[PDB]
Amino acid sequence: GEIQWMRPSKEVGYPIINAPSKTKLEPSAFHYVFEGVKEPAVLTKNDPRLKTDFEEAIFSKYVGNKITEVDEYMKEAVDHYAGQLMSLDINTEQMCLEDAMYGTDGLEALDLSTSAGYPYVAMGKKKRDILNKQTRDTKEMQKLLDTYGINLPLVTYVKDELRSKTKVEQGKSRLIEASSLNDSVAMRMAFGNLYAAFHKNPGVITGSAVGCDPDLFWSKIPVLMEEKLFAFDYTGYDASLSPAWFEALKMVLEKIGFGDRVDYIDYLNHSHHLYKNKTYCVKGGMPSGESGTSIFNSMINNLIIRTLLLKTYKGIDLDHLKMIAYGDDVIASYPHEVDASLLAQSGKDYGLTMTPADKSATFETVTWENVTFLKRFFRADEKYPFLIHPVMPMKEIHESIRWTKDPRNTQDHVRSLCLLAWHNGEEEYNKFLAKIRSVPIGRALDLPEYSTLYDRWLDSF
Numbered sequence: 266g267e268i269q270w271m272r273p274s275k276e277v278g279y280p281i282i283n284a285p286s287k288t289k290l291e292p293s294a295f296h297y298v299f300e301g302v303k304e305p306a307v308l309t310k311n312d313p314r315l316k317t318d319f320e321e322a323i324f325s326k327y328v329g330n331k332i333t334e335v336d337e338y339m340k341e342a343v344d345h346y347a348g349q350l351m352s353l354d355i356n357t358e359q360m361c362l363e364d365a366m367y368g369t370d371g372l373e374a375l376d377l378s379t380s381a382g383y384p385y386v387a388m389g390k391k392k393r394d395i396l397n398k399q400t401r402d403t404k405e406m407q408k409l410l411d412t413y414g415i416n417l418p419l420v421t422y423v424k425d426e427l428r429s430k431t432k433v434e435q436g437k438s439r440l441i442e443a444s445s446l447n448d449s450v451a452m453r454m455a456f457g458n459l460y461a462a463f464h465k466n467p468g469v470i471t472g473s474a475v476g477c478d479p480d481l482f483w484s485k486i487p488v489l490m491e492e493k494l495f496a497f498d499y500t501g502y503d504a505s506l507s508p509a510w511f512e513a514l515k516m517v518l519e520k521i522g523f524g525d526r527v528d529y530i531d532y533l534n535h536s537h538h539l540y541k542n543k544t545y546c547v548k549g550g551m552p553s554g555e556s557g558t559s560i561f562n563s564m565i566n567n568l569i570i571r572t573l574l575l576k577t578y579k580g581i582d583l584d585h586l587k588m589i590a591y592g593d594d595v596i597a598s599y600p601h602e603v604d605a606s607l608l609a610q611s612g613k614d615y616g617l618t619m620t621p622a623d624k625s626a627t628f629e630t631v632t633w634e635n636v637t638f639l640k641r642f643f644r645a646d647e648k649y650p651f652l653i654h655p656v657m658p659m660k661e662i663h664e665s666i667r668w669t670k671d672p673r674n675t676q677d678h679v680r681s682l683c684l685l686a687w688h689n690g691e692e693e694y695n696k697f698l699a700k701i702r703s704v705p706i707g708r709a710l711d712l713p714e715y716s717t718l719y720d721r722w723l724d725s726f
């Protein structure tokens with residue numbers, strides 16, 4: 266991804282976009298009961314914590330575009346993946362406006378708490394004023410589509426979240442490039458059934474894990490992985506994608522029956538954004554921060570891994586590449602050992618910056634004991650080995666519980682963390698509950714005990 270140009274929005278006929286300047290994150294009632302070192306990400310140029318130009322820092326994610334065309338290895342990767350998706354017999358029909366809006370089997374309804382994007386954000390018109398879940402009314406939306414059409418500017422927001430001290434000082438805040446409600450609706454109508462098909466088939470055929478329930482899915486993953494696992498992390502995945510990866514994606518859509526609307530991908534690839542009082546044009550780069558793009562990111566990941574394997578190991582049998590992606594995160598396997606360090610080298614030439622899995626300093630062998638997917642490890646249950654625990658370390662949960670975005674959601678926030686933490690074991694889970702109950706706020710929460718969560722887990726299979 267690369268920024269073509271940037272300049273005053275008024276110069277191209279756009280209004281200034283008002284974005285919040287103060288974090289909604291604040292110390293929670295557990296701030297001093299649990300250890301933590303993360304703070305709210307910088308949201309404005311004038312943050313006292315900054316030690317470098319803010320604007321420069323947030324846009325530095327666009328490292329440029331290392332490739333132009335789709336080479337021979339990418340074409341091969343496209344044929345193999347597309348061929349693989351074909352076995353799913355995906356409904357290529359466009360989805361009706363209603364379902365695209367309020368959901369159907371395999372597709373959750375539009376999120377009402379997220380931005381409606383341009384131009385609604387400049388007219389102070391919310392999503393709650395356009396659709397109601399009770400009526401499933403399409404009249405208002407239909408009128409808005411007819412009025413403002415599609416291919417509208419994406420509105421940029423700095424993501425309000427916890428970041429390390431280093432990332433705060435270096436102004437490295439992540440960004441959300443929210444597309445207009447019109448485009449999200451149009452895209453869900455164009456690809457609605459593809460999305461549903463993926464959500465209902467998380468695994469190694471779709472090569473995707475979006476829509477999955479870790480508590481249940483973790484027990485299925487091992488039986489899908491090959492003998493030798495391999496993995497690595499990306500640095501700025503979305504922003505690094507060159508236009509070629511988007512073309513590769515369109516070829517896949519074409520071969521599986523969606524050639525009808527591959528134009529929507531151009532909208533993601535070559536897109537223009539609004540940020541404050543500035544407007545800019547980006548070539549390449551997948552718009553970040555929205556869930557409407559995690560499937561295409563996942564699809565592209567499948568194309569990337571396949572490409573690097575073909576380029577690095579001619580003769581590789583892609584039919585024995587078993588991988589599952591979730592955006593840039595991935596867990597993969599092959600009957601034979603592979604060199605992630607070598608693959609990372611091939612990656613550079615394709616505009617991808619790959620590093621050791623889970624921030625190691627060197628590329629080590631990935632095993633079932635050290636592998637993580639969505640920050641979670643894999644641990645067989647002591648009593649029923651065939652049941653696999655998705656284990657997220659307590660460090661993450663501790664960091665998160667030390668802050669709040671709304672006292673009214675304290676119960677849900679803490680309950681959410683409990684669903685993640687009990688997997689660390691009864692002894693650890695109880696220490697967690699005891700500390701929570703060491704302060705008034707915690708003692709007033711309704712939280713599940715360990716045996717209750719274990720029982721519920723067994724009853725969910």
Ligand code: NA
Nearest residue numbers: 533534549550
């Ligand atoms: Na883009």
